[PDB]
Amino acid sequence: AAVINTNYLSLVAQNNLNKSQSSLGTAIERLSSGLRINSAKDDAAGMAIA
């Protein structure tokens, strides 16, 4: 469709950008802290064991 009111492609690109940014954020946190398991939401049992 040749409509301008809403751009589905832009929305999909925004979603994929957000996913990539979340991956970048978790990678950056794990690099800076040096700890894979911080903010227990990743590997919740792992943080208890550690």
Place this chain on the structure above:
Amino acid sequence: AAVINTNYLSLVAQNNLNKSQSSLGTAIERLSSGLRINSAKDDAAGMAIA
């Protein structure tokens, strides 16, 4: 025939012109707003779904 009081052809042309202008008005409104479903008289259930 040779009648001048009433001009049937002019009336028919005016009616067709009115139909054309109504179509132009709907097209102009949809163009400016961008919404096909506007003025709920057009696509009544469509506006409910929207």
